Amino acid sequence: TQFEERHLKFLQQLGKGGSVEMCRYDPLQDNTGEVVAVKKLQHSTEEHLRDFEREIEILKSLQHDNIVKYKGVCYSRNLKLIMEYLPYGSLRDYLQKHKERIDHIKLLQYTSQICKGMEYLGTKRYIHRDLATRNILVENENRVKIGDFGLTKVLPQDKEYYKVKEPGESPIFWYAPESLTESKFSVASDVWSFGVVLYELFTYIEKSKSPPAEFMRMIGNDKQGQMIVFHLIELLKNNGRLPRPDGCPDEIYMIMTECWNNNVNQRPSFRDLALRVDQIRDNM
């Protein structure tokens, strides 16, 4: 069933980078309609349209408790992607506001759910590419979901990585070394980014400890532009890593270091991450 553009009412702009708005779908014109999240393109080049339609088919083929829900598309191309609205916003903002009132056991609940959504995504041969707490959404106290599939690629049939020929804006401080050097993305590079997510969680989003702040201090704050990427590559090749966060249990920190292995084949799988984190949880 269809969404008519005429009945989509604007409420609030939520974020940009396309843009995401809060709308009410109100066919009845008496404001009783469902509140939804709407993504639309702000600069609608032919390349971007075709990227956006691929994003739409990716989100639509996904159905999992820990993946943001597709609801439909509104036509008039200038497509709008209609999705569920998650009112607690991104995990990053949520953790920031509610800091250490979220205990380690709760952090591990979210980490488990992140690994399950990621493992399900991999069974369809999708590489998220932008796994980070700002792209995880909170449905309620007991559930998060993976969002913004903006950067997601499908693996070729005959290959286990996808090579991005002309990169756009890239979250380098979450990127595996092979992604930095050769622009190669794989299930294993998602696992590397997951390690950085787990770091984010255990720092409680303290600004002076964010991945960009720490890596910049390690390479020196005088590095600029593409010299940053050059020094970050050398640093990672020589075992420079993010530190253990204040108060982080030793075993969760081991998992982070394991995901940050230079050797792609030695990084753990999301299936084994979810098993291990559920084991830590039960122990606690």
Ligand X SMILES: O=C1Nc2ccccc2-c2ccnc3[nH]cc(c23)[C@@H]1c1ccc(O)cc1
Distance CA 252, CA 271 (A): 16
Q: How many other C-beta atoms are found inside a 10 Å radius of the C-beta of residue 236?
A: 20
Residues in CB range of 118: below 8 A, 6 or more apart: 128, 131, 146, 190, 194, 270
137 binding ligand X? (CB under 6 A): yes
Give the CA distances from residue 161 to residues 106, 128, 152, 172, in Å, rounded to whole numbers and listed in that order.
33, 12, 12, 18
For residue 195, say whether it is annotated as part of any ligand binding site. Answer: no
Site string for Na ion, 5-34 (x = CB under 5 A): ---x--------------------------
State the catalytic residue, choosing from 30, 93, 130, 246. Answer: 130
Residue 187 is which amino acid?
Answer: V
Residue 263 is which amino acid?
Answer: N
Q: Which is nearer to ligand X, 40 or 125 (CB)?
A: 40
For residue 179, say whether it is annotated as part of any ligand binding site. Answer: no
For residue 247, say whether it is annotated as part of any ligand binding site. Answer: no
> 86: which 2 tokens?
């998650």
Active site residue 30: no
Q: Which is nearer to Na ion, 73 or 229 (CB)?
A: 73
Q: How far is the CB of 137 from ligand X (least distance, A)?
A: 5
Q: Considering only residues 52, 149, 161, 215, which one is a binding residue for ligand X as defined by CB under 6 A?
A: 149
For residue 20, say whether it is annotated as part of any ligand binding site. Answer: yes
User: Of Na ion, ligand X, none, which one sits near residue 68, judging by CB under 5 to 8 A according to partner kind?
Assistant: ligand X
Give the CA distances from residue 200 to residues 95, 179, 195, 211, 246, in Å, rounded to whole numbers and listed in that order.
10, 20, 9, 8, 12
User: Of ligand X, Na ion, none, which one sits near residue 148, judging by CB under 5 to 8 A according to partner kind?
Assistant: ligand X
> 162: which 2 tokens?
């996808």
The residue with tokens 């041969």 is 125
Distance CA 97, CA 205 (A): 10
- State the number of binding residues for Na ion (CB under 5 A): 1
Q: How far is the CB of 259 from ligand X (least distance, A)?
A: 22
For residue 15, say whether it is annotated as part of any ligand binding site. Answer: yes
Q: Which residues form the interface with Na ion (CB under 5 A)? A: 8
Binding-site residue set for ATP: 14-20, 39
